[PDB]
Write a protein that binds this ligand. Structure first.
Ligand SMILES: CCCCCCCCCCCCCCCCCC(=O)O[C@@H](COC(=O)CCCCCCCCCCCCCCC)COP(=O)(O)OCC[N+](C)(C)C
Ligand SMILES: CCCCCCCCCCCCCCCCCCCC(=O)O[C@H](COC(=O)CCCCCCCCCCCCCC)COP(=O)(O)OCCN
Lengths: 48, 615, 69, 93, 50, 487, 73, 75
């Protein structure tokens, strides 16, 4: 073999799926922003 | 092949410096000089294949700063203008390398010297071959760095240390303008390369918003570039360094003080020719500054009584002349005088060093008398060099000084007439102190000591071959280059040097000559010869020593201390800066004033408030 | 002659560890007030005014109204 | 875990972003923000390629470059009006 | 401080001799006429429009 | 699957193993500490291989719950900027171990505990997207630096030096904490991705920007508050003092990039002249203060102050090239200042004077140290061909494109940089040799010679070819500059 | 005391016995590493101009007279 | 003086001031040297065949290909 065959493949298996990363970030943003309003309404409750 | 022109001196310097213990004081001397001579041969080949075989060579190695639309690359511009300076730098560098091996045979730290010289050669090759402002800026800063290192060759020497430090600061303050210039021209073109701004450099016509008030854009850029060239050409602004720069070794001074770093500031203008011609305002102030510096140096050199000090002022006068040549859009005489100067002042520097180190290392005019018949070789050499310096009719220096003065006379602008007057009156001064140098030494009764004359040893052969080569050059090069490059529209420059249709006064600088002004600087030269001979050989009973009451000793001090620039500038700028960096910033800003919040400012505050709270 | 450390001269020790603590000297004096009022409140104000003036002049050339800042 | 080729994210437009209420769909606002730079870099790169066009034009024509590159000089000068984030004349994107 | 007094005179000579070059007005003393080129002073080869 | 969790766990394992090692086994303590540090460095380097410099979103993220309702939680990750800081943090610490290698017998194992603790502590700062926990780890570095300055300080006056470095930091820290509380109570969470997408009030923007500036103007030395750095920095051990200017100085300046510029788009524009008028006069005043200095350590610290005040100008000048140049200058400064303090500390570990008056003519001896010192002075001298010049040229370009006045004052900084650093070089290692004080002295042995090798190679590499550094983060800088506005 | 300090660039009067042997190696060392500089440059030096007369650089170069047009860069 | 042999048996000074031992034995490498050296080699190899193995994906080459296929659409 040669260093390209032993390096390119390892790098491209270590990159780990850029599109799925963006998708996961998107639903994480949506889910945590939805939870944010729930937390705000939790704090809005009066003591009595 | 073209990469070998630049990288071989760097490789030789690196290997010599890294393995200066593996190679003796002569191994590095014969190795680095051989590499530099190979580079010189390569430069000659490139000159044959480019200057005559007119086809410029272009290349790009790798992107240096690959940011957004700020493409910086390691490419070089092997252009017709550039290759002439390739010849100029390589030939003189190789000759200086051959010169130094004889001089440095006694100086212990030999290999470090050729290491520094090759570093300088590599840096200035990178500068002249460069095609980007920032990539030219590395050469611009490296020339100053090598200048500092070479003047600082004597770490024990206290004067050399202070001279080197002051030279670095003044050169930094000088090229401040050029450094501002790179990004000044970038904010209008969004690029830094040369070929993409010389294509369209006349289109912008807007203004800017500077610190105080709105001014022009192109004119401001050219002004900044000229201020940058001031630091590396010892102009009126900052020329405190060159007169005090000859505190180091001699062979380098033939290369740094009068041959090549001389060419940096003028080559700044020469390379960016289609930028200054579209900024007429900058050209006029450039002409004023050049004429003022030339006259100032020419009248400066006459009083001084040292070999190296006076010729430094001659170099500064030639700097002023060349800056004016670059200030009237007549860049042809600028580069022609550059090529001549690199011959007939490097030759004089080698001759001065030869007569200095062969006479028990003494450089003086008051003490050393006459020993011309003791050795005719290097005196014949220096006589030829001086004859070129005055520009005796039908010599190498005449073909430059005559044409540059005629060009000064022809242009009727408010700066052309004033600067022509200043150059005409400076010809008398230069022909006076050149012959003063020729007379106070070698043509007077010997006033030296009786021990040094006995210990006399002529110039060794290896150091005399560079002198022979320079003498052969600066007697035929003027005649050979008069027609081929200043010949009313010679077709070898191509895009290297561009002259606008409007400000092109060359044909009427020769066919409209009144013949009462063209041959007048020879008249001032012969008058200076007469007065110098009379004062310094026969009529010296009262014309030499003036023991009057007042206004005559102070006249002596005014020009000896060079207009008190080293006094007024020091005390009023750097002494004040050093005073107020300790008694202002360290007193009423950080330490003492706002330190009322640190130790002893609030610590004692809580030694009373907290105490009276338990009770 | 086997000490790698410096001799620590007495006359140099005071010079060294005297400028390190200048709070006692720089407390209340006439020249201090002038220096502070001319180089810590004066110059910063002048340069700030220069910068905002430059921004205003840049805005005017483009034509957009100047921001309050 | 990628293909060996150059990535392609999206080119047409982000549908979620509405200019009238920029902060209404936080999920789609970041898409608009990244799309702005991914489309401005295209203009920056085409400015660079036309710069090299001009540079090689000046490097080939010779002394007649004041009459055989004006069609590209006008294509450069107008391309610097709204390129990147470099001068206070921001492009109207 | 006496050096500054000599400094003013030293630069005063330069600017003073610079003003004297304005008092003679060599611009109007040209023995020839401004240079003229064909094709609107070479308009096509200096810019403008083809 | 070399994720960020292991990069933080490895120093923790190194510290934990060192805790239960007897003091007698001095052979094993240094070996295992250095091995842990080098494994951490390699684990940081391998991240650069799999960085994927294409996406605008964040790289490998680790989420660990911190509150019962997942309101705010440990959320790791790098985008394009903190990656290089993580690499340089992981690289500086093994140099810290190596420089303090010979005298480890007196230091004991507690010396490596503090350094490894601070190691993973600063690792957890740069890759921390959650805003509040970024403050928890942002001020967590107080204890290790406090201990390093105090326990192993050079002179006895270290007691007063540490108090300033602590209290000045706490004041701004709590001022920032109040702003964090205001943001959390208003928005609801502190996650960075969400909090960047919240419409703020202009009146609220200015107050919160000021509150962040309360502390971030202390980490980067500003005009009102810069006294702590020299006093608390000359009086620290060389191995410890080399990261006060190495990573402890880049928190606030980098904190501006991540939590101020994209956070408050409409407030930085309104406060731009104030930052200009602070930094431009800082680069002048501090540089002038540098000239009239005698201690060898303080001059380098003042030069570092000037460099940080210069990079602050280029950071707040929002340009695609200004911010990139700011990051390049910060990395280059982290290299060069670290190298300079090692260079001036190797002199102290042999003679213990810290005075330029005693030093002189050190070229006639120890020439290798003289060559290294000259190279690093040139790097601090701001010469093209070194990584610094790439650093401040982009700063000047970004500043001039926005404001013409600020660029001239900033370049006055690199003009004045030739007044103190070159003077120090010629006054320390190029003067007249004096045998009265420096009776005897050696040269650099194999340890400090190898210490400067990575510094030299990285310096040259990032100076002559800074493409890879700019290549890896052009997307992130573009995303940061274009925020809030849509034109 | 000069013999004690290494002086990596060579001592003041450093004169090794076999300095000629080292110089021969050093000169040979420059030449052998100079070839990659020359060989790697052969893929460079783009000069679209054609000289009026033949130069001697046609043997190792071919980047002349080929880059004529500027519409496909 | 270009023909006489040099008057030096050995280059003056000691490399890193480490006195060479008696002839025949090795240098007796120190504890820190081996891990530091192997880590330097690992750093060199990772930055050599890792940096020149990462695919060139960025905002520069993607924009380059996109603008090369988008500037050609002038019609
Ligand atoms: C703009 C920055 C560019 C990069 C910086 C490197 C440029 C060169 C900078 C170093 C130049 C040499 C300065 C060394 C210090 C000078 C004073 C000194 O310490 O001298 C030492 C060091 O001597 C040297 O000069 C060594 C020079 C080594 C530098 C060679 C490398 C220069 C070329 C590299 C440039 C980079 C190439 C491009 C890389 C891609 C010993 O000299 P001696 O002759 O032995 O005298 C000492 C007295 N006594 C014998 C009694 C001890
Ligand atoms: C005294 C003995 C010292 C031994 C050191 C070597 C001896 C020579 C020393 C001279 C200085 C040389 C320094 C290297 C200069 C390299 C300049 C070009 C580098 C470059 O930009 O190209 C990169 C090459 O990758 C690479 O492979 C670069 C590998 C460089 C390894 C250097 C390791 C230093 C580690 C320091 C870490 C410091 C961290 C600070 C943050 C990739 O470029 P590309 O993206 O275009 O790829 C192309 C894909 N088409």
């Amino acid at each position: 073999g040669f260093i390209m065959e032993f390096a390119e493949n390892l790098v491209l298996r270590l990159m780990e799926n850029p599109e799925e990363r963006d998708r996961k970030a998107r639903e994480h943003i949506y889910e945590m922003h939805e939870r944010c309003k729930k937390i705000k309404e939790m704090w809005a409750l009066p003591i009595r | 092949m073209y990469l070998l022109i630049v990288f071989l001196p760097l490789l030789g310097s690196s290997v010599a410096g890294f393995f200066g213990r593996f190679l003796g004081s002569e191994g590095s001397a014969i190795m680095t000089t051989t590499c530099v001579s190979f580079s010189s041969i390569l430069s000659l080949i490139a000159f044959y294949e480019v200057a005559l075989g007119a086809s410029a060579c272009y290349l790009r190695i790798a992107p240096w700063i690959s940011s957004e639309m700020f493409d910086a690359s390691w490419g070089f511009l092997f252009d017709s203008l550039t290759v002439v300076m390739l010849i100029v730098v390589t030939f003189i560098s190789s000759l200086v390398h051959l010169y130094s091996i004889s001089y440095m045979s006694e100086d212990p730290h030999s290999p470090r010297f050729m290491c520094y010289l090759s570093i300088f050669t590599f840096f200035m090759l990178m500068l002249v071959t460069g095609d980007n402002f920032l990539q030219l800026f590395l050469g611009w800063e490296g020339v100053g760095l090598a200048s500092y290192l070479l003047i600082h060759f004597w770490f024990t020497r206290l004067q050399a240390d202070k001279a080197a430090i002051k030279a670095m600061l003044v050169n930094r303050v000088g090229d401040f303008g050029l450094a501002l210039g790179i990004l000044g021209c970038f904010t209008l073109f969004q690029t830094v390369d040369f070929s993409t701004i010389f294509a369209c450099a006349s289109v912008p016509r807007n203004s800017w918003i500077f610190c105080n008030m709105r001014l022009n854009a192109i004119s401001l850029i050219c002004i900044l570039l000229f201020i940058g060239a001031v630091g590396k050409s010892a102009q009126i602004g900052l020329h405190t360094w060159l007169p005090d720069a000859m505190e180091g070794p001699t062979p380098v001074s033939a290369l740094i003080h009068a041959a090549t770093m001389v060419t940096a500031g003028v080559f700044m203008i020469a390379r960016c020719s289609p930028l200054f011609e579209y900024s007429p305002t900058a050209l006029i102030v450039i002409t004023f500054a050049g004429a003022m510096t030339s006259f100032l140096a020419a009248t400066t050199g006459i009083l001084q009584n040292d070999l190296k000090r006076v010729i430094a002022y001659s170099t500064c006068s030639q700097l002023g002349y060349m800056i004016f040549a670059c200030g009237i859009s007549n860049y042809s005489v600028s580069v022609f005088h550059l090529m001549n100067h690199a011959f007939f002042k490097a030759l004089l520097f080698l001759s001065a060093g030869s007569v200095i180190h062969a006479m028990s290392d003494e450089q003086d005019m008051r003490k050393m008398g006459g020993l011309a018949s003791s050795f005719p070789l290097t005196y014949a050499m220096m006589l030829i060099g001086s004859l070129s310096l005055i520009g005796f009719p039908f010599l190498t220096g005449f073909y430059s000084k005559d044409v540059i003065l005629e060009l000064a006379y022809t242009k009727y602008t408010i700066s052309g007439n004033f600067a022509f007057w200043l150059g005409s009156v400076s010809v008398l001064f230069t022909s006076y102190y050149s012959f003063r140098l020729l007379f106070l030494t070698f043509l007077v009764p010997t006033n030296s000591f009786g021990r040094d004359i006995s210990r006399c040893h002529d110039a060794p052969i290896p150091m005399a071959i560079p002198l022979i080569l320079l003498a052969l050059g600066s007697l035929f090069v003027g005649y050979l280059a008069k027609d081929m490059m200043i010949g009313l529209g010679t077709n070898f420059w191509a895009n290297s040097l561009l002259v606008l249709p409007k400000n092109e006064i060359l044909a009427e600088s020769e066919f409209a000559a009144p013949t009462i002004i063209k041959l007048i600087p020879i008249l001032f030269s012969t008058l200076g010869a007469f007065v110098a001979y009379n004062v310094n050989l026969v009529a010296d009973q009262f014309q030499r020593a003036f023991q009057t009451s007042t206004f005559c000793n102070r006249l002596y001090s005014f020009f000896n201390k060079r207009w008190f620039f080293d006094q007024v500038l020091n005390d009023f700028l750097v002494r004040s800066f050093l005073r107020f960096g300790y008694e202002v910033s360290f007193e009423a800003l950080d330490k003492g004033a706002i330190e009322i919040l640190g130790p002893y400012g609030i610590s004692y505050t809580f030694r009373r408030l907290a105490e009276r709270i338990s009770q | 002659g086997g000490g790698m450390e410096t001799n620590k001269n007495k006359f140099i020790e005071d010079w060294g560890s005297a400028r390190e603590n200048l709070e006692h000297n720089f407390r209340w004096t006439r020249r201090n007030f002038a220096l502070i009022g001319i180089f810590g409140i004066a110059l910063p104000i002048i340069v700030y005014k220069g910068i905002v003036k430059d921004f205003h002049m840049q805005d005017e050339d483009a034509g957009r109204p100047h921001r309050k800042f | 875990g990628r293909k060996k080729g150059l990535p392609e994210f999206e080119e047409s437009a982000p549908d979620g972003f509405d200019p009238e209420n920029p902060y209404k769909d936080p999920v789609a606002m970041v898409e608009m923000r990244e799309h702005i730079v991914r489309e401005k870099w295209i203009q920056i790169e085409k400015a660079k390629i036309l710069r090299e066009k001009v540079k090689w034009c000046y490097r080939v024509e010779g002394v007649n470059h004041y009459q055989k590159c004006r069609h590209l000089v006008q294509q450069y000068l107008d391309s610097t009006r709204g390129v990147g984030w470099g001068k206070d004349h921001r492009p109207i994107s | 401080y006496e050096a500054l007094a000599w400094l003013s005179g030293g630069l005063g000579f330069f600017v003073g001799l610079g003003l004297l070059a304005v008092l003679n007005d060599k611009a109007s003393k040209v023995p020839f006429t401004p240079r003229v080129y064909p094709y609107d002073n070479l308009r096509v080869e200096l810019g403008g429009e083809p | 699957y070399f994720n960020l969790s292991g990069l933080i766990l490895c120093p923790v394992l190194g510290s934990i193993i060192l805790l239960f090692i007897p003091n007698s086994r001095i052979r094993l303590i240094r070996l295992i500490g250095l091995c842990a540090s080098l494994i951490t460095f390699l684990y940081s380097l391998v991240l650069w291989i799999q960085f994927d410099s294409s996406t605008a979103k964040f790289q490998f993220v680790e989420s660990l719950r911190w509150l019962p309702y997942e309101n705010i939680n440990f959320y790791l990750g790098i985008d394009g900027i903190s990656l290089f800081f993580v690499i340089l943090t992981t690289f500086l610490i093994p140099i810290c171990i190596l420089v303090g290698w010979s005298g480890m017998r007196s230091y004991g194992k507690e010396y490596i505990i503090a350094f490894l603790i601070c190691e993973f502590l600063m690792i957890a700062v740069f890759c921390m997207l959650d805003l509040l926990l970024f403050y928890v780890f942002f001020e967590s570095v107080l204890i290790p630096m406090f201990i390093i300055i105090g326990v192993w300080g050079s002179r006895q006056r270290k007691i007063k030096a540490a108090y300033q470095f602590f209290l000045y930091t706490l004041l701004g820290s709590l001022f920032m904490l109040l702003a964090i509380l205001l943001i959390l109570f208003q928005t609801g969470t502190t996650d960075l991705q969400i909090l960047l997408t919240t419409e703020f009030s202009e009146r609220r923007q200015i107050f919160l920007w000021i509150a962040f500036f309360a502390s971030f103007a202390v980490k980067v030395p500003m005009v009102p508050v810069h006294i702590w750095l020299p006093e608390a920095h000359v009086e620290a051990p060389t191995a410890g003092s080399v990261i006060l200017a190495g990573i402890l100085l880049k928190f606030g300046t980098y904190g501006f990039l991540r939590f101020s510029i994209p956070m408050f788009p409409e407030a930085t524009l309104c406060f731009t002249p104030f930052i200009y008028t602070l930094s431009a006069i800082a680069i002048i005043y501090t540089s002038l203060t540098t000239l009239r200095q005698i201690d060898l350590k303080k001059i380098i610290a003042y030069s570092s102050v000037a460099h940080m005040n210069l990079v602050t100008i280029g950071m707040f000048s929002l340009n695609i090239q200004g911010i990139g140049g700011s990051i390049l200058l910060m990395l280059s400064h982290g290299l060069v200042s670290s190298a300079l303090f090692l260079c001036v500390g190797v002199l102290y570990d042999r003679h213990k004077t810290r005075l330029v008056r005693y030093y002189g003519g050190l070229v006639s001896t120890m020439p290798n140290f003289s060559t290294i010192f000259f190279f690093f002075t040139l790097a601090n001298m701001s010469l093209p061909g070194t990584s610094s010049f790439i650093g401040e040229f982009l700063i000047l370009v970004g500043a001039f494109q926005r404001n013409s006045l600020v660029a001239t004052l900033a370049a006055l900084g690199m003009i004045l940089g030739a007044a103190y650093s070159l003077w120090l070089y010629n006054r320390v290692v190029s003067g007249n040799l004096k045998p009265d004080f420096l009776h005897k002295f050696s040269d650099l042995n194999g340890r400090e010679v190898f210490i400067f090798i990575p510094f030299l190679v990285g310096l040259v590499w990032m100076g002559v070819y800074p493409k890879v550094f700019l290549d890896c983060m052009h997307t992130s800088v573009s995303n940061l500059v274009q925020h809030g506005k849509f034109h | 005391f000069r013999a004690k300090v290494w002086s990596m660039t060579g001592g003041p009067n450093c004169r090794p016995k076999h300095w000629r042997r080292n110089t021969a190696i050093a000169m040979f060392g420059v030449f052998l590493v100079c070839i990659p500089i020359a060989k790697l440059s052969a893929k460079l030096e783009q000069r679209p101009h054609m000289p009026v007369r033949p130069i001697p650089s046609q043997i190792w170069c071919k980047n002349f007279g080929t880059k004529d047009d500027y519409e496909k860069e | 003086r270009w023909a006489t042999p040099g008057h030096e048996e050995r280059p003056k000074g000691y490399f890193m001031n480490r006195t060479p031992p008696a002839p025949g034995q090795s240098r007796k490498w120190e504890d820190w040297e081996l891990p530091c050296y192997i880590t330097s080699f690992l750093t060199i190899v990772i930055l050599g065949v890792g940096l020149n193995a990462k695919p060139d994906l960025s905002i520069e080459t993607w924009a380059h290909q996109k603008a090369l296929e988008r500037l050609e659409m002038e019609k």
